[PDB]
Amino acid sequence: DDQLKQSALDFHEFPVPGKIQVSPTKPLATQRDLALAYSPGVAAPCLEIEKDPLKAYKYTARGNLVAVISNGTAVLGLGNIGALAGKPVMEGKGVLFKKFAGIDVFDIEVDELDPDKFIEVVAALEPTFGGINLEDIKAPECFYIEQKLRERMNIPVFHDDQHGTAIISTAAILNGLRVVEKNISDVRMVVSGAGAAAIACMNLLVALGLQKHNIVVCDSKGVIYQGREPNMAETKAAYAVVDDGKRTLDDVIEGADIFLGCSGPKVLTQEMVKKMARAPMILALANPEPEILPPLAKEVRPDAIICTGRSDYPNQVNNVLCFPFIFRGALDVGATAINEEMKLAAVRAIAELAHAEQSEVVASAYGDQDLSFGPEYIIPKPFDPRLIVKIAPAVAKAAMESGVATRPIADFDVYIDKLTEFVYKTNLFMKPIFSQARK
Amino acid sequence: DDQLKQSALDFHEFPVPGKIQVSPTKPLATQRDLALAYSPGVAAPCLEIEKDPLKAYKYTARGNLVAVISNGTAVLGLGNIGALAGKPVMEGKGVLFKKFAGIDVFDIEVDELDPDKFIEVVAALEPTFGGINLEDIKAPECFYIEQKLRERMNIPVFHDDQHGTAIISTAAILNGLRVVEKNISDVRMVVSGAGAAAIACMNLLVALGLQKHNIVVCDSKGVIYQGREPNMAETKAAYAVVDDGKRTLDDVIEGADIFLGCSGPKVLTQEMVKKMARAPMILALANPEPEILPPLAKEVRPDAIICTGRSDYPNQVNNVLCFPFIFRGALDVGATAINEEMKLAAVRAIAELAHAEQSEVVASAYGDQDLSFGPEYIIPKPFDPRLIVKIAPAVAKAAMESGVATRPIADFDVYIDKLTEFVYKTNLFMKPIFSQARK
Ligand SMILES: NC(=O)c1ccc[n+]([C@@H]2O[C@H](COP(=O)([O-])OP(=O)(O)OC[C@H]3O[C@@H](n4cnc5c(N)ncnc54)[C@H](OP(=O)(O)O)[C@@H]3O)[C@@H](O)[C@H]2O)c1
Ligand SMILES: NC(=O)c1ccc[n+]([C@@H]2O[C@H](COP(=O)([O-])OP(=O)(O)OC[C@H]3O[C@@H](n4cnc5c(N)ncnc54)[C@H](OP(=O)(O)O)[C@@H]3O)[C@@H](O)[C@H]2O)c1
Ligand SMILES: [Mg+2]
Ligand SMILES: [Mg+2]
C-alpha cells in the first residue's frame, strides 16, 4: 500500500493543487469582449432570462452543469471522514463527468449533517445547477435526503449509491435470466444487506417484473420476519415473510435463483452455493472483499454466473458504467426528473449492449477483446465507448415518452452522430495494450 | 440597441452555450490515471486531509477556489431580477478571476432571498471554497449578510458592492491630497446616497486619519443628520452630523473638500461645484450617468480633480481594478479573513502605482499611453498589467503582519517573479492599438 500511497499523493500535489480547474469557453483577449461578457453587455442576457426562465439553458452553462454534493459522512469505504475530507473524491468524479460525458461539475461539499439542513442547503442551490448528484451520504439519511430533494426540487436529483450500480445489477440479472432459460416470474431471489444499492436493486427488479411473493431478504439479524421487531419499517423490512423459523440464511439459500449480495462480505460459503437452483447468479457487490470469490463458486458449480465489483474476474459492476450517461441524456433532453422509466430504459440499453456487439474497429493486434455473450460476458465492460452512444439516447427517449422533458430534441440520428463524434475524440487505447502485455 | 443588445444576447453561445467550463487539469489518457483520481488511489489524499485539514490546499483546489455566491437581488443595475436571471453575470465575474488573477470560480447562486437563510447556506458551503465573493445582494441586507458571515466562516468573506469602490476611491483620495498638498487631518467630507458602496467607504477613510466630525452624509431626502428624523436610521448614525437646519445638499457644502457620491442622477450643478473650496475632489461614482458630468464642472473651476467611473474620461474607478488581485493575496497566503489592514494595504499599493510608473516595455509607437502623475492621473488604469504585482504581495504581507495567515510566504522575490510571469503570459495589446487608432 506504501507504493500506492506515494503514487496517489504525488498525482496532483506538486504540479498544481487539485485535479480540477475552471477555464472559460469564450475567446476573450481584447476589448469589446470584456464589455459584453461583463458590465454593460452581460446585462442583455439577464433581461432575456428575466422574462423567460427557460431561456437560461441557452445563454448559461446550466444545461451542462451537474453538482456532486456531499456532506462527507460515508465516503467510498472510508466512512465518516468528514466534510472536505472527501473533497478530492468529489473532484475525482467531476473529472469522470467530463471525460466520459462532457459534463461540467461543481464539487459542492455541504458541512451540515442534519438531514433537513442538508435538504434546505441543497434546495437553495437549485438555480446554479441543472442536476444534483448526491454522493457519499451515510444511510439512512441518504434515503430521506434523496426523496425530499426529488419531491421538492424541480431538477434531476440522482443518487449514485442508491440507484447507480443498481442499474448495472438489474441489467446483469436480466442478462443472466436471458443466458439460462429462467423466466423472471419463476425466479426466487435472495437479498443480503437491504440498503443503499440493494434497496434500489430490489425495487428496480420489481418494476422490471420481479414479483414480491418470490423475493426474500436476509441480513445480519437474519431474515425479515413478520414479528422480528415491532418497528416494522418499510425502509428495510418491506414485503416481509412470516418467521417460520429460518434463523440463519442457510435455508434461505435453499431453493434460490439469485444472491444479489451487495452489503456484507463472506456471507456466502461453498456449501451454500452448492445448495442453489439449476443456475445461480451470485452478485458479490462488495468492493472491499467480494462475498464469495468467483473461482470457488465456479469450482463448486460449473454452470453459474458470478458478478464481482472488482475487475479481477469478468462481469465487473462499476458505478462509472451508469451515472455520467444517465445525466448526459437527462440534461440533453432537458428533463426535470429522473423517474423509474428512464432507469428502465437505461437497464434495457445496458442489457442490449452485451449481446449486440460487432465490429467497432476491433484492434487487429493487441487488445485481446475476445468477448462474446455468455456466462463470462453478461454486461458491457466499464469503458465500452458504445455505452454513452446507447444509454444517453435511450434515457432521453424515455423523457419523450414520459412528459418530463422541457427541451425535446428531434432527429435522434443527429444526436447519435453528435455522441459518436464525442467518443471519436476520447479513446483509451493504452489499457488494451497493458492488458495484452500482462498475459 | 440591437447593435448592442442582440450582439450581446448571442455573445458566444453559438459555438458553446455559456461561458466557463470545469475542465480537468490531470493527465487524462491511461486507465492508471483514472485510478489515482477515483477508487483505489483517491482514497490516499483523503486520509491526509482528514488527519490535518491544512493539507487540502496541497491536494485540492481550495488554494485557488473562490465562490461568487449571490441571491440575485441587485444585479448590475437591473435590480431584483432573481437568482437565475443573474447567472450569466456571475460567470462573467468568474472569467475575470481566471483572466487577471487566475482564480477558479464557482458561480454559486442561492435561490433564498431571505436575509438570514442565505448565511446558513453559505456557511454550510464553506468547506468547498477558499474564499467567498458575495455580489448583487441588495441593501441594507448586504451589510447584515457580510457581517454575519465574517464572524462565522474561517475563510476570506469579501463583499463586492461595498469594498468595490471603498478601496480605489480611497486611493484616489490618498492620491488627491498629494497633488493639492493637503492633509487628511482637516479635509472636510461630503457623502451622497449612503448605500451599499457609500456607507462602507468612509470607515476605511477614517482608518487613514479622516476624523468623523469632518464627514457630512447626504441622501435623497436632503441630509442624513441627527435630528432630521425622530428615529435615527441604523448604520448611518455614526457619521450623522448634529442638527443645524441643513436640509438640502445645496448648502451643506460650505466650501467642502471632497464629494464622494454613490447615488443615481446628478445632484450638483455649476454653482454647486463653485460653492466647494479650492481644488474640488468630485468622486461621481454612478455607473449609468455621471453625477456631475466632469468636463462641464472642469470648465467651471480649473485645477479640478474630478474622478468618475466611466472610462471615457481619466480617473476611472472600477471594481475589477482591485478585486481579483486582493484575493490573489489572501489565497496565496492562506488568510483566514480579510482584515482592514489588508483592505487598506491594497489602498496604499494602488495609490503608489500612480506616481511610480516608468519603462515597462513601453510601446515605441501606438498605444499613446502618455501617463504622468498629476491632476489627470490619480489611479492606475483599470488594467495596468502591473496591479497584481503591486497589490497581491502587499495584501499578503499585511496578512502575515496581522497574524491572519496560515501558509506564510517565504522571501517575496519568488512571489514577485511568479506574479510577473503570470502577467507576461496574459497580455491585451490590442486595446492600446484601438485607443490610438480611434483618435
Ligand atoms: N459498484 C460498487 O462497487 C459498489 C456500489 C455500492 C456499494 N458497494 C459496496 O457495498 C457495501 C455496502 O455499501 P455501504 O457503503 O452503503 O455500506 P453499509 O451502509 O454499511 O451496508 C448496508 C447495510 O449492510 C449491513 N451490513 C454491514 N456489514 C454487514 C455484514 N458483514 N453482514 C451483513 N450485513 C452487513 C448493515 O446493516 P446491519 O449492520 O444491520 O446488517 C448496513 O446497514 C460496501 O462494501 C460498498 O463498497 C459497492
Ligand atoms: N464601481 C462602480 O463604479 C460602481 C459599483 C457599484 C455601484 N455603483 C453605482 O452606485 C449606485 C448604487 O450602487 P450600490 O448598489 O452600491 O448602492 P444602492 O444600494 O443602490 O444605494 C444607492 C443609494 O443612492 C441613493 N439614491 C438613489 N437615487 C437617488 C437620487 N436621485 N438622489 C440621491 N440619492 C439617490 C439611495 O438612497 P435612498 O435609500 O434614500 O433612496 C440609495 O441608498 C448606482 O449609481 C451604481 O451605478 C458604481
Ligand atoms: Mg463517493
Ligand atoms: Mg454585481
Numbering used by the authors:
A (entry chain B), B (entry chain A): 2 to 440
Which sentences from the paper describe this structure?
While reducing NAD(P)+ to NAD(P)H, MEs catalyze the oxidative decarboxylation of the TCA cycle intermediate L-malate to produce the TCA carbon source pyruvate and a byproduct carbon dioxide (CO2) in the presence of divalent metal ions such as a magnesium (Mg2+) ion. The hybrid-type MEs consist of an N-terminal catalytic domain (ME domain) and a C-terminal activity regulating domain. The PTA domain does not possess an enzymatic activity of PTA but acts as an allosteric modulator of catalysis; that is, binding of some metabolites to the PTA domain increases or decreases the enzymatic activity. Binding of acetyl-CoA to the PTA domain is known to reduce the catalytic activity of several hybrid-type MEs.
To obtain a more physiologically relevant state structure, we added the cofactors NADP+ and MgCl2 to EcMaeBapo solution prior to data collection and determined its structure (EcMaeBholo) at 2.73 Å resolution. While the cryo-EM map of EcMaeBholo clearly shows the PTA domain, the map around the ME domain is unclear. Furthermore, in 2D classification of EcMaeBholo data, the ME domain was ambiguous. These results of the cryo-EM map and 2D classification indicate the flexibility of the ME domain of EcMaeB. Consequently, the catalytic site of EcMaeBholo including cofactors could not be modeled well although we added NADP+ and Mg2+ to the sample. Therefore, we had to conduct further local refinement of the ME domain dimer to observe cryo-EM maps of NADP+ and the Mg ion.
